[PDB]
């Protein structure tokens, strides 16, 4: 295209957007000329580094520090061959909502900072070295997504530049930087305001979807006010990073040659499992941590306090954390119903050091009052949002609601935050944090002894600050899963206010995870995938949400079916049971060949070496949270898999799965709509008015002897 699409009719213009979700955003867009020919120096990646940068004396540091900006994103948007784009999309607070023009002023303050210090070179060589290392050390790749990307640039690059795609830069072009800096001016601004408070005022409706907006151009006072009032306040340039490693040495494997992490450290305080990288050989490491505490799920109130604590806590050092994540050091903080979840992923350089700073930070933390008010109100807005989501998400909520021991609803979560004061909170936290347990998986380029020192470090710091003492092995608990009366089928309904679609989910308590039941459920899952795919969604055209599958929970295996469509639910049940009879005939219709190819398909589906260190770590961690440790369950289950008949699954069907079943553990759940070839006589269910009084006469499952 020899032209841009924003041809001075819609430039220096404003939009007022009515969203579907309750979000608050401001969208700033700059159509900008082509730098595809300027791929050699590529100033736009450096600018994208410098816009959304979080550092000492930065703009966003101040705006977070003033509590005006919750989040932002800005940067270059790709476009056609002739033009390219530059977008800025920021979140809004209450005063962010009122001070928008001053926010644009703060944007212009950062622009004034950029004209004030001009171009920078040491930043360019530093980020160039970061992309050098990161392009330098790549393991392997997914053949999907990658190939589509490099085929996107195969059109644009020579046969030697298709690898070295953008991760290497020859020169510094400050004339280009200043040039696009001159392009970033109030002449060039597009404005889009997103608010749900726009009522009666936005007339121009979208043609396809139907959102409504209004132009209502900014008067010239603010514009001329925008050019002349260009000054700097307390702005500083961010400092050189120190998080660059020279650790590049791969450690040779020792006499302790194991394919699975060993319990190298046990205390009544801790429990530590460890394995080094056999395959991938990278200097990197991945670290997983659970912080166990009894008081996490005692009530809604304090769990909310934990969530807000962990959230505002994580947000505190985030401005410091930006360079580490910018350097390729990723992590995770997450509360659980049990406790807190920590993850540390990246290279071997300073995970102890930084993690020390993390433990000291979350150990010793202070509270601001208005920050507390914003986070309290913000998650309060996030609470009553939960009345409006998709019925499958709603169904998975009730799924994990009913199939645990205790569960706190969102209603009482909404009401209990009425009394939350900061002295009450900040008083409870060290009482909370006084006594807890940590279990951890560490994987990557390290030794056992250095791992012992890292763990030692952490818990030492813990006892140093809060005088942490270990837990009781009688308060090492899990939440159990509910026994059924072995033949009963109960159901109840929930009415969705907003959505016109109905949901439903049907659940089966088979057994614990014995070696037989894993292969039972996997094989039965595999055989029901394609005929359901063939008839229900395709042929019966019920809906798009049609899911089935496992439920590994509380050491108990389980079977579930997730379907959301706009139907009568008992009608929908009738076609579910019709699919069940269809499978019933499809049992006896299996040949030997279908059997053998089908179980070989499941074998290669199950058996695979991993393709990512994070992949196998999530699986292993999924054992660790279930305390199972059965490291070679795969070959064990395959050895069982070869010992299976057709009649085995007949006998699995008749007593456990069939309609004539003394071992029937069937339960359905209805999620209603907004205004909501042979079928037998199903038994009458009963409605579930009180789920506690529902569970009042239901027994509980045992737990698993750990392998």
């Amino acid at each position, epitope marked *: 295209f020899p032209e841009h699409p924003f041809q001075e009719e819609h430039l220096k213009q404003l939009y007022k957007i009515v969203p579907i979700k309750d979000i608050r955003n401001l969208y700033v867009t700059f159509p900008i000329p082509d730098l595809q020919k300027y791929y050699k120096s590529n100033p736009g990646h450096y600018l994208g580094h410098l816009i959304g940068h979080e550092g000492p004396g930065s703009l966003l540091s101040e705006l977070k520090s003033k509590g005006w900006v919750n989040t932002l994103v800005g940067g270059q948007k790709e476009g056609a061959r002739g033009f390219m784009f530059f977008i800025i999309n920021v979140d809004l607070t209450e005063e962010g909502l009122l001070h928008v023009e001053d926010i644009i002023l703060h944007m212009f303050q950062y622009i004034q900072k950029l004209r004030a210090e001009g171009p920078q070179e040491w930043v360019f060589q530093e980020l160039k070295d970061l992309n050098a290392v990161a392009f330098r050390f790549k393991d392997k790749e997914r053949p999907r997504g990658y190939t589509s990307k490099i085929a996107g640039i195969l059109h644009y690059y020579p046969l030697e530049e298709v690898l070295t795609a953008e991760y290497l830069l020859e020169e510094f072009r400050p004339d280009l930087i200043e040039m696009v800096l001159d392009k970033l001016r109030p002449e060039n601004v597009r404005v889009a305001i997103v608010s749900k408070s726009f009522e009666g005022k936005t007339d121009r409706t979208e043609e396809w979807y139907g959102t409504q907006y209004k132009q209502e151009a900014i008067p010239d*006072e603010v514009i001329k006010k925008w050019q002349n009032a260009d000054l700097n306040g307390k702005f500083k340039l961010p400092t050189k990073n120190e998080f660059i490693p020279t650790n590049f040495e791969i450690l040779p494997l020792e006499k302790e040659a194991t394919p699975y992490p060993a319990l190298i450290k046990d205390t009544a305080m801790s429990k530590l499992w460890f394995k080094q990288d056999d395959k991938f050989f990278l200097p990197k490491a991945n670290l997983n941590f659970e912080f166990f505490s009894p008081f996490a799920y005692v009530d809604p109130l304090h769990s909310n306090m934990a969530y807000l604590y962990l959230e505002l806590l994580k947000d505190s050092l985030n401005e410091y954390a930006y360079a580490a994540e910018l350097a390729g050091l990723s992590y995770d903080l997450q509360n659980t119903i049990y406790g807190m979840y920590l993850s540390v992923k990246g290279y071997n350089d300073k995970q102890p050091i930084l993690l020390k700073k993390i433990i000291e930070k979350m150990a010793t933390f202070e509270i601001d009052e208005k920050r507390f008010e914003i986070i309290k109100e913000a998650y309060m807005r996030s609470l009553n949002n939960f009345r409006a989501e998709q019925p499958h998400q709603h169904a998975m909520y009730y799924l994990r609601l009913l199939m645990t021991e205790v569960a706190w609803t969102k209603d009482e979560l909404k009401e209990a935050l009425d009394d939350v004061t900061l002295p009450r909170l900040k008083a409870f936290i060290p009482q909370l944090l006084s006594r807890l347990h940590i279990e951890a998986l560490l994987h990557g380029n390290i030794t056992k002894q250095a791992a012992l020192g890292i763990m030692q470090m952490v818990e030492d710091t813990l006892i140093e600050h809060a005088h942490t003492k270990p837990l009781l092995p009688s308060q090492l608990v899990r939440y159990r899963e509910v026994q059924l009366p072995d033949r009963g089928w109960f159901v109840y309904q929930q009415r969705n206010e907003v959505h016109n679609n109905s949901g439903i989910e049907i659940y089966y308590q088979t057994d614990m995870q014995s070696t037989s039941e894993n292969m039972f459920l996997e094989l039965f899952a595999q055989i029901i995938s394609e005929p359901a795919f063939n008839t229900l969604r395709t042929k019966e055209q019920l809906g798009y949400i049609v899911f089935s599958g496992p439920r590994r929970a509380n050491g108990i295996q389980g079977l579930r079916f997730i379907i959301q469509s706009e139907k009568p639910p008992h009608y929908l049940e009738s076609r579910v049971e019709a699919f069940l009879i269809t499978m019933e005939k499809s049992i006896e219709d299996m040949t030997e060949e279908a059997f053998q190819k089908h179980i070989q398909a499941l074998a290669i589906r199950r058996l695979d070496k991993p393709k990512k260190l994070s992949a196998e770590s999530a699986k292993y961690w999924g054992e660790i949270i279930s305390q199972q440790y059965n490291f070679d369950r795969d070959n064990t289950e395959v050895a069982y898999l070869k010992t299976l008949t057709k009649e085995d699954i007949i006998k699995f069907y008749k007593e456990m799965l069939a309609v004539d079943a003394p071992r029937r553990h069937k339960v359905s759940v209805h999620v209603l709509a907004r205004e909501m070839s042979q079928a037998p006589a199903l038994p009458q269910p009963e409605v579930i008015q009180n789920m506690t009084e529902f569970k009042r006469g239901l027994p509980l499952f045992p737990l698993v002897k750990p392998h």
Partner: antibody
Amino acid sequence: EVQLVESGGGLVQPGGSLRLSCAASGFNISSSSIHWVRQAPGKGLEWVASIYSYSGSTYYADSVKGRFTISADTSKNTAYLQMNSLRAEDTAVYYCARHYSAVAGLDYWGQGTLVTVFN
Amino acid sequence: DIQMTQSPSSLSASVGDRVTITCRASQSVSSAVAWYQQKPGKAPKLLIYSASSLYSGVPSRFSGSRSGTDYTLTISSLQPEDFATYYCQQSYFNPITFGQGTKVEIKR
């Protein structure tokens, strides 16, 4: 072509609540927008408030922020100000005033209005 | 947050006199300051905007001068109608401040 008719200002006791109007006729509040001004008798000035009805941006003073409520009917080019918890230092005569397209240009003025806080 | 020192508080001079009045900002300000006139029982008037520029419709006998923080309205020749209280005002996104008020009286 420019007409600022503010009115509605009467007589009230302390602790009460009132609402004031400002009708910007001859032009649009979608253009360069209006301001609220405290002026005590025999005393100086204050900039009470400013709405930008094109962008919905409110801007308040530091002392009485939150307790007062501005609103703006764009269909009549006419803004409003709910007042609450009225106190005895606010008995004065108040003006509405238009900033024009300039960097500091606050050219036009209004009729003024009567504010009275009395036992 | 920046306050305004309107100097002097007042003075007295007659028609055809040179009156320079200096408002001083508390901080280093880029001149967004206006200068005003208000006769009693009347609406105020924009004499000088941007602390140096003349509003259209005002005679050019009046002028404003940016000098760092020292901002100064200069009257070349006084008039029989120019006896009114004057002001100066700083307008950023920050809330707008004013001057102390300077009443113009005659010399008798």
